[PDB]
Amino acid sequence: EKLFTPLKVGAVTAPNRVFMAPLTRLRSIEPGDIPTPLMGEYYRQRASAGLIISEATQISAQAKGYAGAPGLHSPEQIAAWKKITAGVHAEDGRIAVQLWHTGRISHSSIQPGGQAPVSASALNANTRTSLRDENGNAIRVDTTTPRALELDEIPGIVNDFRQAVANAREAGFDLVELHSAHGYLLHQFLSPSSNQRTDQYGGSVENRARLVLEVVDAVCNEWSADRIGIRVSPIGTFQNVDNGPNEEADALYLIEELAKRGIAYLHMSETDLAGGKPYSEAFRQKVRERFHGVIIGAGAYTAEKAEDLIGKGLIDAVAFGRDYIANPDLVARLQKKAELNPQRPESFAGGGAEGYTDYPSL
Numbered sequence: 517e518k519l520f521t522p523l524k525v526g527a528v529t530a531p532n533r534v535f536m537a538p539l540t541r542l543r544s545i546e547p548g549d550i551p552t553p554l555m556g557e558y559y560r561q562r563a564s565a566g567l568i569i570s571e572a573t574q575i576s577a578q579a580k581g582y583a584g585a586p587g588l589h590s591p592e593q594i595a596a597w598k599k600i601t602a603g604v605h606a607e608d609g610r611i612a613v614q615l616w617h618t619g620r621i622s623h624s625s626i627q628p629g630g631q632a633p634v635s636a637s638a639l640n641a642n643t644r645t646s647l648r649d650e651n652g653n654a655i656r657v658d659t660t661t662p663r664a665l666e667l668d669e670i671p672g673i674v675n676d677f678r679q680a681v682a683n684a685r686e687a688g689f690d691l692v693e694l695h696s697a698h699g700y701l702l703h704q705f706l707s708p709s710s711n712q713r714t715d716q717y718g719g720s721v722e723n724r725a726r727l728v729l730e731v732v733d734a735v736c737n738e739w740s741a742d743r744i745g746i747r748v749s750p751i752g753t754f755q756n757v758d759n760g761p762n763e764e765a766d767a768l769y770l771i772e773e774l775a776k777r778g779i780a781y782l783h784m785s786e787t788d789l790a791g792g793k794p795y796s797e798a799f800r801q802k803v804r805e806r807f808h809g810v811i812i813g814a815g816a817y818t819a820e821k822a823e824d825l826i827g828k829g830l831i832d833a834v835a836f837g838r839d840y841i842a843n844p845d846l847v848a849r850l851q852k853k854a855e856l857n858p859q860r861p862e863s864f865a866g867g868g869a870e871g872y873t874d875y876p877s878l
């Protein structure tokens with residue numbers, strides 16, 4: 517077994533290869549999109565993970581698409597996250613913040629000024645996001661048609677990612693993960709399905725990847741390349757965003773570009789919850805020969821699949837999502853071959869302590 521052996525992940529050293537995937541739980545305070553001590557307890561419980569990757573966190577107020585998702589743009593958010601990272605560190609853990617802009621997976625009622633959310637193009641996502649009702653409970657609501665960003669707004673978006681990384685470093689995170697997956701803003705630019713722009717940020721794959729690579733360069737310059745990871749979902753369809761008619765070649769272009777920056781890791785979200793065609797071993801080989809940082813695989817993994825792919829030299833670590841919701845001590849359980857706690861999906865999104873901090877250890 518290799519899952520319980522250490523791994524260098526850029527600037528930090530993980531003691532095992534069992535990572536906690538980013539998981540939106542929608543329990544932040546409004547007004548202010550503020551993380552809470554309850555969230556701190558949840559993360560502290562999971563500090564034995566090789567690496568915790570936080571729930572997706574707004575780079576700006578405009579970035580918000582979900583009621584209850586936290587930000588990392590305000591002083592109060594910075595202060596609250598500082599307490600959370602300190603608690604994880606007190607338990608000898610490591611924590612990355614996943615930073616997003618939701619783009620068109622959003623609703624005008626939670627945008628600044630009540631305005632339409634932004635995207636690469638003015639095309640509805642044709643999905644739902646999660647808002648809160650008058651009692652503060654999570655509700656699913658159809659997405660608002662977005663406004664296409666003007667060319668002169670793009671530097672501001674890059675600056676918002678840069679600023680959020682400055683804030684993340686101050687807040688005590690060990691790494692940052694850019695959310696370039698799952699149909700959110702960066703992926704909206706990457707995908708031809710969502711990007712119909714005819715300027716330097718659409719058309720060719722070079723142009724479609726331009727924004728994400730500008731963001732990568734800005735955040736590497738703000739902090740250091742060995743502090744930066746990126747999550748992609750570049751094969752298949754996620755939240756109605758496919759990867760276009762040349763998805764493999766386009767993915768390999770992006771990955772070769774990322775490699776040039778010497779970033780800490782590439783995190784591949786392989787499938788959504790409904791599943792789909794597995795990655796071919798040939799594709800995994802092509803990725804591996806092009807990227808020289810850590811590769812994290814995710815999406816309905818088992819420990820056995822992770823060991824197989826680590827043993828084949830194709831990935832370095834695995835991120836578990838739902839098994840981490842339900843098993844704070846997932847590392848110990850997988851090491852000991854213990855049963856896993858029963859998941860309670862009704863409490864994944866929103867609410868309070870129940871279904872959040874009340875899953876037991878062994």
Ligand SMILES: Cc1cc2nc3c(=O)[nH]c(=O)nc-3n(C[C@H](O)[C@H](O)[C@H](O)COP(=O)(O)O)c2cc1C
Binds near residue numbers: 541747814817837
């Ligand atoms: C409740 C829930 C929230 C999620 N939130 C995020 C998120 O904030 N960022 C992200 O990149 N993926 C998110 N995902 C995807 C997970 O990180 C993970 O890739 C997915 O659940 C599949 O892995 P699993 O089979 O181990 O759960 C979420 C998944 C679930 C079930």
